[PDB]
Design a protein around this ligand. Structure first.
Ligand SMILES: CNC(=O)CN1C[C@@H](C(=O)Nc2cncc3ccccc23)c2cc(Cl)ccc2C1=O
Ligand SMILES: CNC(=O)CN1C[C@@H](C(=O)Nc2cncc3ccccc23)c2cc(Cl)ccc2C1=O
Ligand SMILES: [Cl-]
Lengths: 298, 305
């Protein structure tokens, strides 16, 4: 029993965090094989013009108490790749993957190449993440684990005026309409991740919370009209198919659960809580609910 | 900016997790130096659990009855002893991944990270607090026994909890790493219940200071309170009494924001009376009590917004 915002064990990622310094800018880097990946703004903009003026020795890379020697450098989109003379002996099995809004991942928050904390979060529909980062956190990474393979999906680049965060995949492509410069940029109006709220309602039923269950069902179109009114993301047939296993485990059809969500949206909770929360939680995917309610290990 | 329920990086603890098997029972163990620590109920059957005589069950065991697996390697048990509700298995190999560590017993209100494991394999990490009723609101399934709680301040791991059981309300009970239970619980499948729980007041106050540091002040008011009047009110809402110790501990956050502790107490009194009125504090519609004054200082900026 119990339901917590759970992150993947961070050890395989901790063994890859290094500190990268260029001039007065210090941030974090990801050391995999003989390459260190970090935000290209460490050289700060005309990034090609700033980069051409740099030599390998201008970049200081520190791994624990050891200095790594930079023997090459190149840029891939908004990521700088520093070729070093030592392959990381702690390099785990890994892949670089680009995630979609609504998908969750673990973040290993670092400062000066040293991991300080780990938390779970989701890529918002507006492509920002509601993280917890201070100055010096740039280069901190987001990831998921599948068996023994780490799938790196996020590298932290900046904080927007509303306190939310923006970054790139490990190939340097931003998530969202953001650029890596100190210009006027704002997060677009956000929406609630509907398939995730439904998954978390199934998790509450599995844990013995059914006060919100009702005898009603709804059509997918009628539910979508109601969802559009409360700034909820549209629910698609793919989302219904993905919720199939949780529907079979609890005996509550997806459209049956959608009618419960409609009633919570139109009437509130009435002083009640679901899984210790007074808000409808949208940062647990259907797969996260199945994993936590099954005990998958790494 | 931002405020999340943040756990310590779990790598130093992952390198200590092993699987311990006794007959048909399999659970998790903590391998530090040449000793594996695990719940003593690994020597029990489901039947034994009603009234187990651990000393009588243990005397019938030899070293080779305990199977310890670290990754894909079998560790050889060369000794065993019982310390309170923990079994200590002496092994022939010191853990090369043993971090710098200490065993610390925590008090209610203290927070810690939990590395949930099954079959000696870590599955997830989450943050939580020792409730005033000595239980933890964890997320544990069958096979998680022996999973540990810890803090990593500096490079030293302070182990504070080892998981032993789930109570009928779905909450969890366990021991410190010397085998002493937190709370009036026993490692028996007997009628046991968590006492009525209360809200950790000093933690809610700390989290209100965190909201002010992050730029939110809608909940403040022009009033102050005496410490006694605050306690007479908060205890009507099942809040723990606030002591002079708690007031002293909140001193640094009070100086950083310019809000006296008894003025923050008046704001809490009003919040309890009025609710949130459709508003949130740090993305929450409830008053959060699983962040300590020390957690707020560690996670928030030193510069108030
Ligand atoms: C809030 N930030 C600022 O006022 C200055 N700022 C610096 C930098 C940036 O956001 N870093 C930070 C990252 N995460 C948390 C931060 C908390 C506080 C301060 C800075 C943080 C940055 C990087 C890029 Cl690629 C583009 C723009 C900027 C930028 O505008
Ligand atoms: C909920 N418990 C049970 O039905 C059976 N049970 C087995 C065992 C125990 O609680 N293990 C479990 C630990 N954590 C989460 C659990 C989730 C589900 C099932 C078992 C869990 C146990 C250990 C001790 Cl020291 C004392 C009593 C018991 C006991 O009563
Ligand atoms: Cl303590």
């Amino acid at each position: 029993s119990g339901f917590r915002k759970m992150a993947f064990p961070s050890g395989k990622v901790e063994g890859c965090m290094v500190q990268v310094t260029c001039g007065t800018t210090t941030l974090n880097g990801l050391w995999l094989d003989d390459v260190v990946y970090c935000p290209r703004h460490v050289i700060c903009p005309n990034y090609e013009d700033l980069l051409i003026r740099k030599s390998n020795h201008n970049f200081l890379v520190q791994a624990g108490n050891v200095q790594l020697r930079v023997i090459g450098h190149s840029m891939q989109n908004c990521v700088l790749k520093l070729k070093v003379d030592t392959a990381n002996p702690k390099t785990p099995k890994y892949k670089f993957v680009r995630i979609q809004p609504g998908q969750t991942f673990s973040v290993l928050a670092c400062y000066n190449g040293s991991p300080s904390g780990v938390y779970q979060c989701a890529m918002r529909p507006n492509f920002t993440i509601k993280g917890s980062f201070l100055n010096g956190s740039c280069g901190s990474v987001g990831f998921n684990i599948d068996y023994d393979c780490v799938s790196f999906c996020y590298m932290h680049h900046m904080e927007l005026p509303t306190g939310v965060h923006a970054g790139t995949d490990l190939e340097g492509n931003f998530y969202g309409p953001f650029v890596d410069r100190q210009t006027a940029q704002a997060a677009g109006t956000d929406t609630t991740i509907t398939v995730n709220v439904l998954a978390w309602l199934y998790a509450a039923v599995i844990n013995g919370d059914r006060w919100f269950l009702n005898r009603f069902t709804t059509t997918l179109n009628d539910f979508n009209l109601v969802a559009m009114k409360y700034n909820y993301e549209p629910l698609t047939q793919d989302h219904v198919d993905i919720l199939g296993p949780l529907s079979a485990q609890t005996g509550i059809a997806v459209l049956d659960m959608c009618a419960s969500l409609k009633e919570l949206l139109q009437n509130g909770m009435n002083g009640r809580t679901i899984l210790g929360s007074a808000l409808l939680e949208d940062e647990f995917t259907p797969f996260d609910v199945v994993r936590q309610c099954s005990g998958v290990t790494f």
